[PDB]
């Protein structure tokens, strides 16, 4: 992994020591090269994972999340340089440093071989994430929403620490490979029930689960484009990746301790998909789409079947590329009309022909048009939850019907109709904006030709 | 509002069209149309405004149960087949300011004339601003009408969009 | 009553403007000015050869285009599909599975020269 | 749509053509500026029926509010030109 | 693009072409030719192919219903 950590570290000396005008060209061109060498992580074997050292390994579940992570950094530089053109150079370089710092923690987070090393790097990510979202965030609106952290830390990160520490004193190790061969059944007990919640609540909030989701729409409204791209694409997946790993040592308690959460997710899919219909802000509509999609991932993880785990891994990767593409498309308008209201600008397909095409592809993959990996993931989750209980096809079916409605309602409102007469600043799309969309949807469509790489370690 | 004079007249046109839909054939429509005219002229001489209103009350109520469930609608009118059909082809004129200079070379003469028209708007605006100010009754205009030009070579206030609106069938 | 004197004036003033603007929308005889665009002799050949045309002359030109279509858009695609099916798809088990042919009474087998037994004699219905 | 071109002169002929066939009105009295209420002396009701006829000549509705403001043939002709953007 | 070889007519029956009418006759008449030949050569399909027997007219000899006493 050092082959990736080190060159990612060397991006900070690169940014600081570059010509003042060539920071974006260097950082984007060299953050792109790092991603190219990240295709070496697909040296996967059928029986055994790819273990590099005592600290870091890479199995089929982390390989895509690592390649997605390093693919996103060059995209987040292209997305952000336009609205950072005003501000001075030293403040400009720090913004790039925070993004390079975030990648470095994320590549170590997905590959950490020990759970405390994962936990520490799992919380260290929030440090760059919060600086980006609050210092460069477009919103100074004053939320007082730190109570969502006070709720998170008190109810999430702290119990995860006490449980992980408790487990090591008992099992003797937190090496993931060791837990595969040393895990023991979790007997029913009021003490074990608290261990189960401690090991999962931290990840449920980040997904986020229904009921704990209200932080996500607020965070997306504040964050700059870079904050939302990393937040929707990856940081939501840290909870998903965390639950896939940690459910190994929670059996068989997951059989009966997962009923309350599945009922939140299954019913959560319908509630948030319906709320999308009535949304007035793009970023909130896209933010509520994420909660509706991640609700499948939570159900897939908790029913723990070989098909569901393949489904969750495809959804996590597919959702990441799609949602970040939608966030960028929403930002392209905001960089014009300078508002996040959906109704403000309409009929934009009359003035921006090619951009309307990108909107169409992004919407199609969000509503899950076969054979996109957006449906390969969703179909597998639907197949397995059917076995879990045939009734779930009712809730799964309705969520497909609503999902097509806000997917296309978003398309119809912003791209169809009569253009708003008074808006006269819809300049033609830049090559930066078209290249940025093409780098979300060309990889996303090409993955359909070889879908095995994203189907996880259960493949 | 519209006063009892207009309100009744509208009913005439609306009632006629529905009849025209019901009878379908022209001949039956014409004959049944004349009968309708008779009912209108019968009480046209009623000089009691209080009574005149009551005729309308029942008149409209009669219409409500005469209306054809599907009344014929002109294709290019609201509710018609072709309504808003071409709004996709109508591109607002200001989009031409963003054309690449190489493109604009393809249409030199038209763009040359466009510069003339743009210059007219810019210079006239300051004069046009004044005209509304002076005529405006302090406290906000009470009606949406506008005043025509009161000097030679002065264009009526707010003329750009009405003049340069997209054609009916641009393509 | 119709339009007040001002309304009649305003509509008149604008109307003249609208009609001039629409008049300006017309294109000049030279427009649109274009770069020449290249012409390969393949273009040149038919440009003058078919200038006179006539049925017997241009039937060659119509058959020419279809020939260019047929070779590029039918013959070449079927070589690729045949090379692909014969030397890649049929060289793997069960890729192309075909329903076994219908064997009727009194038929001859190519493989074995076998002759299927004839059917029993029908009850000799009136037919 | 083949070619249904419209020009002011042609529109003017058609509007008058329809006007002449209205029995209540006389052919020779009629002229482009013949106020319906006065020069031809017709009820306001009859003014409605003239409008409804014109809609069918060109097959496009004239809104109720704007129909009232039309009171002479020359008004109608220019209204058509406006809606159908007849410039020459 | 024949320069609108058909010219519009006002309040009058349109201009038609001879060729347009000929082909219309050829196919519309051809429909009747086909319909007629099919009745003639294959009338059975419309009117049946075999005689539907009457169940009641059959004898208990063929239906083998033994005598009431038997």
């Amino acid at each position: 992994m050092l082959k990736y950590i080190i060159p990612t570290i060397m991006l900070m000396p690169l940014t600081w020591l570059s010509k003042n005008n060539m920071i974006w060209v260097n950082s984007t061109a060299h953050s792109l090269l790092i991603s190219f060498t990240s295709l070496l992580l697909m040296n996967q074997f059928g029986d055994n994972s790819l273990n590099f050292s005592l600290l870091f390994f890479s199995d089929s579940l982390s390989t895509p999340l690592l390649i997605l992570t390093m693919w996103l950094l060059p995209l987040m530089l292209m997305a952000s340089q336009h609205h950072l053109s005003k501000e001075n150079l030293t403040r400009k370089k720090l913004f790039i440093t925070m993004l390079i710092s975030l990648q470095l923690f994320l590549i170590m987070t997905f590959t950490a071989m020990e759970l405390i090393l994962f936990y520490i790097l799992f919380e260290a990510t929030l440090v760059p994430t919060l600086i980006i979202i609050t210092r460069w965030g477009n919103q100074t609106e004053r939320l007082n929403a730190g109570l969502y952290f006070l709720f998170y830390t008190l109810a999430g990160s702290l119990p995860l620490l006490v449980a992980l520490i408790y487990i090591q004193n008992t099992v003797g190790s937190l090496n993931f490979l060791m837990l595969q061969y040393w895990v023991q059944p979790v007997h029913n007990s009021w003490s074990n029930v608290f261990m189960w919640l401690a090991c999962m609540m931290a990840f449920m909030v980040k997904m986020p689960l229904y009921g704990l989701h209200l932080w996500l729409p607020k965070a997306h409204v504040e964050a700059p484009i870079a904050g939302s791209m990393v937040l929707a694409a990856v940081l939501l997946k840290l909870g998903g990746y965390g639950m896939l790993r940690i459910t190994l040592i929670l059996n068989p308690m997951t059989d009966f301790m997962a009923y309350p959460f599945i009922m939140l997710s299954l019913w959560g899919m319908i509630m948030t998909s319906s709320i999308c219909l009535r949304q007035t802000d793009l970023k909130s509509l896209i933010a509520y789409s994420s909660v509706s999609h991640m609700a499948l991932v939570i159900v897939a993880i908790l029913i723990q079947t070989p098909w569901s785990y393949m489904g969750a891994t495809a959804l996590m990767i597919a959702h990441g590329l799609t949602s970040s593409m939608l966030f960028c498309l929403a930002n392209s308008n905001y960089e014009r009309i300078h508002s996040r209201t959906m109704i403000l600008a309409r009929g934009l397909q009359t003035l921006l022909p090619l951009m309307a095409t990108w909107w169409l592809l992004a919407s199609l993959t969000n509503l899950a048009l076969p054979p996109t990996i957006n449906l390969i993931g969703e179909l597998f989750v639907v197949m397995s939850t059917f076995s879990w209980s045939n009734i779930t096809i009712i809730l799964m079916g309705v969520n497909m019907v609503i999902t097509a409605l806000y997917s296309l309602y978003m398309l119809i409102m912003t791209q169809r109709g009569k253009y708003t007469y008074h808006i006269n600043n819809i300049s033609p799309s830049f090559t930066r904006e078209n290249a940025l969309m093409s780098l979300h949807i060309l990889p996303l469509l090409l993955l359909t030709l070889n879908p095995k790489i994203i189907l996880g370690p259960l493949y | 509002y519209l006063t009892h004079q207009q309100k009744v007249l509208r009913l005439y046109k609306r009632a006629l069209r529905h009849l025209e839909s019901w009878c379908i054939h022209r001949d039956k429509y014409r004959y049944f149309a004349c009968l309708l005219r008779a009912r209108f002229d019968e009480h046209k001489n009623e000089k009691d405004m209080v009574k005149a209103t009551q005729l309308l009350r029942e008149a409209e109520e009669e219409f409500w149960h005469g209306q054809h469930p599907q009344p014929y609608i002109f294709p290019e009118s609201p509710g018609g087949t072709s309504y808003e059909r071409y709004e996709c082809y109508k591109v607002p004129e200001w989009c031409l300011d963003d054309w690449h200079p190489s493109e604009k070379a393809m249409y030199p003469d038209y763009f040359a004339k466009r510069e003339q028209w743009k210059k007219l708007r810019r210079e006239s605006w300051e004069r046009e601003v004044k005209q509304l100010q002076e005529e405006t009754p302090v406290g906000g205009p009470r009606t949406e009408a506008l005043p025509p030009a009161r000097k030679q070579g002065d264009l009526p206030p707010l003329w750009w969009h009405i003049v340069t609106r997209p054609r009916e069938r641009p393509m | 009553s119709g339009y007040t004197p001002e309304e009649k004036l305003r509509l008149q003033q604008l109307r003249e403007l609208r009609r001039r603007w629409l008049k300006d929308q017309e294109l000049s005889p030279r427009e649109p000015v274009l770069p020449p665009q290249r012409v390969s002799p393949v273009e040149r050949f038919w440009n003058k050869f078919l200038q006179d045309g006539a049925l017997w002359k241009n039937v060659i030109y119509k058959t020419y285009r279809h020939s260019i279509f047929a070779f590029t858009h039918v013959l070449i695609p079927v070589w690729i599909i045949h090379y692909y099916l014969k030397y890649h798809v049929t060289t793997k088990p069960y890729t192309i599975v075909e329903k076994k042919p219908r064997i009727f009474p009194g038929d001859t087998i190519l493989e074995t020269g076998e002759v299927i037994p004839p059917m029993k004699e029908f009850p000799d219905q009136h037919h | 749509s083949d070619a249904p071109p419209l020009t002011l002169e042609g529109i003017k002929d058609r509007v008058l053509y329809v006007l002449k066939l209205y029995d209540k009105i006389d052919p020779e009295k009629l002229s482009v500026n013949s106020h319906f209420m006065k020069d031809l002396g017709l009820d306001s009701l009859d003014q409605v029926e003239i409008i409804m006829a014109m809609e069918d000549e060109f097959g496009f509705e004239i809104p109720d509010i704007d129909a009232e403001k039309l009171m002479c043939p020359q008004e109608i002709v220019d209204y058509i030109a406006d809606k159908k953007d007849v410039y020459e | 693009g024949g320069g609108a070889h058909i010219e519009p007519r006002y309040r009058q029956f349109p201009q038609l072409t001879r060729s347009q009418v000929i082909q219309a006759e050829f196919f519309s008449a051809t429909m009747w030719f086909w319909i007629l030949w099919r009745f003639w050569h294959d009338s059975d399909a419309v009117l049946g192919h075999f005689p539907y027997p009457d169940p009641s007219q059959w004898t208990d000899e063929e239906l083998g219903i033994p005598p009431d006493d038997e």
């Binding site: 033609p428 830049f430 | 690449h100 493109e103 997209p166 641009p170 | 929308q25 017309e26 | 070619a3 | -």
Partner: peptide, 17 residues
């Protein structure tokens, strides 16, 4: 197609970019 001249400038957004 059926008439001469009458070619009107067609207003479209920039297709160059």
């Amino acid at each position: 197609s059926g008439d001469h001249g009458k070619r009107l400038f067609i207003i479209k957004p920039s297709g160059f970019y």
